[PDB]
Amino acid sequence: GKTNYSREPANQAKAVKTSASDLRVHFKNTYEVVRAIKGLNLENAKRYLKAVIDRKRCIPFTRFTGCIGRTAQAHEFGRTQGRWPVKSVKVILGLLDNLSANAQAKSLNTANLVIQHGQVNRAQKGRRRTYRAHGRINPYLNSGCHVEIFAQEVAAK
RNA sequence: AGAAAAUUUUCAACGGUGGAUAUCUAGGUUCCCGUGACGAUGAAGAACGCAGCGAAAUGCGAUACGCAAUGCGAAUUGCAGAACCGCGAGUCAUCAGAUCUUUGAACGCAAGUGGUGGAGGUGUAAAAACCUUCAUGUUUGUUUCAGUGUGGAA
Numbered sequence A: 001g002k003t004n005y006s007r008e009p010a011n012q013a014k015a016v017k018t019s020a021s022d023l024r025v026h027f028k029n030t031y032e033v034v035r036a037i038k039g040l041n042l043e044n045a046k047r048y049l050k051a052v053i054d055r056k057r058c059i060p061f062t063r064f065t066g067c068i069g070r071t072a073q074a075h076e077f078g079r080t081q082g083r084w085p086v087k088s089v090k091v092i093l094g095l096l097d098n099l100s101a102n103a104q105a106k107s108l109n110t111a112n113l114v115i116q117h118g119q120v121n122r123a124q125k126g127r128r129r130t131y132r133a134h135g136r137i138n139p140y141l142n143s144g145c146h147v148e149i150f151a152q153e154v155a156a157k
Numbered sequence B: 001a002g003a004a005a006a007u008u009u010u011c012a013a014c015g016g017u018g019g020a021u022a023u024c025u026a027g028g029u030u031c032c033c034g035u036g037a038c039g040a041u042g043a044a045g046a047a048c049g050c051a052g053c054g055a056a057a058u059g060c061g062a063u064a065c066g067c068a069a070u071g072c073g074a075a076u077u078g079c080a081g082a083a084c085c086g087c088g089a090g091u092c093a094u095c096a097g098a099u100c101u102u103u104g105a106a107c108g109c110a111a112g113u114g115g116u117g118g119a120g121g122u123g124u125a126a127a128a129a130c131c132u133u134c135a136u137g138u139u140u141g142u143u144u145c146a147g148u149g150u151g152g153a154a
């Protein structure tokens, strides 16, 4: 399980990398949480994810639209539909936390970390069964995650 | 030029899915040559067992991954403990002597049963319990026999 991040940061003493692999969270959901985190401040990402968890804010749905509920919360976005994929958020959040603690040994400051490169990949699907009428059986699976995120320090003048 | 994103889409790089391709092989396949060599002295097959730590596969049978003999002459090894430098190591080979549970042509009778007869041994005051033994056909004989079968002396 050695992570190869597809994209690399320009300054690696100035960067922080996290990845988790072969997760059990829903792909599409995770995908969109992440897609929503890109390009923010680590502190912001954390606040806003916590806020999604507390339901006071929505995680926009971008790529996977299939019949997703419209909320007023989607105003923040320009969107109609979004949700609160709690499990995904919690996992991602844990990843951000690994980012911050991952900055510790580097002696880097949190305030100026910015998130560039979230990557969510469809992992090997976990397999099981579903019994169907007439004695048919159909697949019942889960689509797992690979996630990686790196954070750059950018100084604000 | 609703000249930003999202979606739809072309191309590349990297990553993910996936296991194609290439290169291998204690395998297969076919050809030629050599031996035919199982069994009531209980075969082929079946059951259950047997390692200090073992399920399988392979070996083995209460002497149970093995005894003996012989040849190699120092290992086994995943762990632990011993044994051995030749009084000889070994998961080595060879193999001509042994061990060979319950079965199965399967055999006292019977059987989805470790059930149950007779004879002998044992055990006991007498028992129980344990042990050995008994299938059918056939060729000779041995012994004991039957037949208003054929003969037949005193």
Ligand SMILES: [Mg+2]
Pocket (backbone or CB within 6 Å): A001, A002, A003, A004, A021, A146
């Ligand atoms: Mg990985």
Ligand SMILES: [Mg+2]
Pocket (backbone or CB within 6 Å): A130, A131, A132, A133
């Ligand atoms: Mg059903």
Ligand SMILES: [Mg+2]
Pocket (backbone or CB within 6 Å): none
């Ligand atoms: Mg590829």
Ligand SMILES: [Mg+2]
Pocket (backbone or CB within 6 Å): none
């Ligand atoms: Mg020896």
Ligand SMILES: [Mg+2]
Pocket (backbone or CB within 6 Å): none
């Ligand atoms: Mg007879």
Ligand SMILES: [Mg+2]
Pocket (backbone or CB within 6 Å): none
């Ligand atoms: Mg007569």
